[PDB]
From Swiss-Prot:
Species the sequence originates in: Escherichia coli (strain K12)
Disulfide bonds: C30-C33
GO biological process: cellular response to antibiotic
Top-rank lineage group of the source organism: Bacteria
Family stated for the protein in its record: Belongs to the thioredoxin family. DsbA subfamily.
Keywords from the UniProt entry: Disulfide bond, Periplasm, Redox-active center, Signal
Compartments in which it is found: Periplasm
PANTHER family: THIOL:DISULFIDE INTERCHANGE PROTEIN DSBA (PTHR35891:SF2)
High-level lineage: Bacteria, Pseudomonadati, Pseudomonadota, Gammaproteobacteria, Enterobacterales
Entry-linked InterPro entries: DSBA-like_thioredoxin_dom, DsbA/DsbL, Thiol_disulfide_DsbA, Thioredoxin-like_sf, Thioredoxin_CS, Thioredoxin_domain
GO CC, any one term: outer membrane-bounded periplasmic space
Name of the protein in question: Thiol:disulfide interchange protein DsbA
Length: 188
């Protein structure tokens, strides 16, 4: 067939019950995730092609970057709680991987301050149990699928995107194939 298990996607041998519809995982340390987000814009183009009533969830992971990697998962929780993902994603990726100016939790905080989040608001969120709950949700979701590589995208806790079965001679074609596969899987 045109889409086949083991090709554009794989099937989870143990399907995850109650999982978000479209679940993306990434790390601000992850060089391929930088490409996916800053160059290819995977999330946006997927989000874009999604059917109506299909929600998209994106979570950070801990297993890259040690202590700072864990700080970044908490900061992504702050980003989600405040609703400022579209303001901090670019400067977080560039601070970690382009300028390499992000070396501490304080450097992370600087990115939010510069993006216009007030110091008091960041700190209250950072220290909040709402954010601790959001950290826990990110860890649980990754745990549910034995997650050990990023970038990754899962559909309905059953299917895992497989970009390795896609041509990358043209970036735009790769992206739309990826997006159309997510759409196909969400309709499945
Ligand atoms: C794990 N994902 C890696 C991957 C797979 C397919 C294509 C790419 C890229 C194409 C252009 C920049 S990056 C990266």
């Amino acid at each position: 067939a045109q889409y086949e298990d083991g090709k554009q996607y794989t099937t989870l041998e143990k399907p995850v019950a109650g999982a978000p519809q479209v679940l993306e995982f990434f790390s601000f340390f992850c060089p391929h995730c930088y490409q996916f987000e800053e160059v290819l814009h995977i999330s946006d183009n997927v989000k874009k092609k999604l059917p109506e009533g299909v929600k998209m969830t994106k979570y950070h992971v801990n297993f890259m970057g040690g202590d700072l990697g864990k700080d970044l998962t908490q900061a992504w929780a702050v980003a989600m709680a405040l609703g400022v993902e579209d303001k901090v994603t670019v400067p977080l990726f560039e601070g970690v991987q382009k300028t390499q100016t992000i070396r501490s939790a304080s450097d992370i905080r600087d990115v939010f301050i510069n993006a216009g989040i007030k110091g008091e608001e960041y700190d209250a969120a950072w220290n909040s149990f709402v954010v601790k709950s959001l950290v826990a949700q990110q860890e649980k979701a990754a745990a549910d699928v034995q997650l050990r590589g990023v970038p990754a995208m899962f559909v309905n806790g059953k299917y895992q995107l497989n970009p390795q079965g896609m041509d990358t001679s043209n970036m735009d074609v790769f992206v739309q194939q990826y997006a159309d596969t997510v759409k196909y899987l969400s309709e499945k």
